[PDB]
Design a protein around this ligand. Structure first.
Ligand SMILES: COc1ccc(S(=O)(=O)N2CC(C)(C)CN(S(=O)(=O)c3ccc(OC)cc3)C2C(=O)NO)cc1
Ligand SMILES: [Ca+2]
Ligand SMILES: [Ca+2]
Ligand SMILES: [Ca+2]
Ligand SMILES: [Ca+2]
Ligand SMILES: [Ca+2]
Ligand SMILES: [Ca+2]
Ligand SMILES: [Zn+2]
Ligand SMILES: [Zn+2]
Ligand SMILES: [Zn+2]
Ligand SMILES: [Zn+2]
Lengths: 169, 173
C-alpha cells in the first residue's frame, strides 16, 4: 500500500460529508447508499466515524462534474479518468469529484459508483495507490467482483490502519 | 424591455435543453417540471419550440452549482446572486446555472425554481434586465406571497417578440 509524502492525515476522528449534487444516471437514493457503504467500508476498520451535512462546508464534499469544474484538473469526457479526490486538509482537500460523462451504475453494467467511491474516499483519508493488484486502492477500482464477493484486502486495511489504527471499540 | 449588447439571437427556431445535474433540495421530476414550465412560458409567446436531450451538447445546458464551478463567475453563497445565464450563442452561451447554496422550492418558502428559471431562460434567449418593475426580466426576486396566477408582462412579451416574433397560430389583438 502507499501513503502520501509526509503522511498527511486528518487530526480528528469524526469527519463530516456532504453530497453537493446528483447525477441524472441514478435515483438520488441510490447515490446516497453508494456513498454510505463507501464510507462504511473504511469506518469499520478504523476508529473513524462519519456524519452528514446538508449545508455548510463538510470535510468531504462530494459532487458530479464534467470537464472544467471548480479546480485546475478538468475531467476528460467518457472513460479514462472516472473520478478524483484530494488528500486530507481544509478547503478543497478531502473533496471527491465524479465524472458525469461516465454512466454511474448500481451494478457492474456501467461504472459502479460504490467501487469507485470507496477508492476515492481512500484518497480523501490519506491513501495513495497500491501496487497490489487485489487492493481497492489499486487504480482499477470498478474492475472488481463487486459486493457479492468484494472485501477490503488486508493491504487496504494495513494501509488505513497505519494512519488511524484499528477499531478500539 | 432591454436586450443584450450586440443583440444576439438564435437562428434556429427549435432549441434543445439538458438537465446536467440535480439539486438535493427537490426530487428529480420536480426540477424537470419546473424547467418544462419555465420553457412553456416563452413558447406561448413566440414561435420557439424546445426539446430535451439526455446526452451530448444541448443549446441550453442547465446545472446547479456552488462557489467556483468552472466558469467566469463564481457563486457567492447562501444569498444575493441566486442564478445566472448566458446570452445566445455556442458553448457556454445560452446555458443556465443555479446557485445550489439556495433552498430551491416548488412554492414560495425558499427560492422558487420556476420563477428564477423563467428569468434565466429569458437571458438564454436574448433578454437583458428590464426597467419595468412588473416585468419578469426586472432583476428583483419578489417577496410576493402570491404566485398561483403567473403571467408574462407585456414588456417581457414585447422584448422576446422583437427577437423572434409572435406565434404563427395566434390571432393578434
Ligand atoms: C448576463 O446577464 C446577467 C446579468 C447579471 C446577472 S447576476 O447573476 O449577476 N445577478 C444580478 C443581480 C444581483 C442584480 C440579481 N440576480 S438574482 O440572482 O438575485 C435574480 C435571479 C432571478 C430573478 O428572477 C426573477 C431575479 C433576480 C442576478 C440575475 O440577474 N440573474 O439573472 C445574471 C445574468
Ligand atoms: Ca474539504
Ligand atoms: Ca472521464
Ligand atoms: Ca452520467
Ligand atoms: Ca450552450
Ligand atoms: Ca448566492
Ligand atoms: Ca440547495
Ligand atoms: Zn475536480
Ligand atoms: Zn485513485
Ligand atoms: Zn456559472
Ligand atoms: Zn438576471
Amino acid at each position: 500500500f502507499r501513503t502520501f509524502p509526509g503522511i498527511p492525515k486528518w487530526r480528528k476522528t469524526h469527519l463530516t460529508y456532504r453530497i453537493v449534487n446528483y447525477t441524472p444516471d441514478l435515483p438520488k437514493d441510490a447515490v446516497d447508499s453508494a456513498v454510505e457503504k463507501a464510507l462504511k467500508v473504511w469506518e469499520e476498520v478504523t476508529p473513524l466515524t462519519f456524519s452528514r451535512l446538508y449545508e455548510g462546508e463538510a470535510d468531504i464534499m462530494i459532487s458530479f462534474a464534467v470537464r472544467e469544474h471548480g479546480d485546475f484538473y478538468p475531467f476528460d469526457g467518457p472513460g479514462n479518468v472516472l473520478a478524483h479526490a484530494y488528500a486530507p486538509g481544509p478547503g478543497i482537500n478531502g473533496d471527491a469529484h465524479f465524472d458525469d460523462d461516465e454512466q454511474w451504475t448500481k451494478d457492474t453494467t456501467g461504472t459502479n459508483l460504490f467501487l469507485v467511491a470507496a477508492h476515492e474516499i481512500g484518497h480523501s483519508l490519506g491513501l495513495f495507490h497500491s501496487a497490489n493488484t487485489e487492493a481497492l486502492m489499486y487504480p482499477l477500482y470498478h474492475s472488481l467482483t463487486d459486493l457479492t464477493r468484494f472485501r477490503l484486502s488486508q493491504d487496504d486495511i494495513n494501509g488505513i490502519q497505519s494512519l488511524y489504527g484499528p477499531p478500539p471499540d
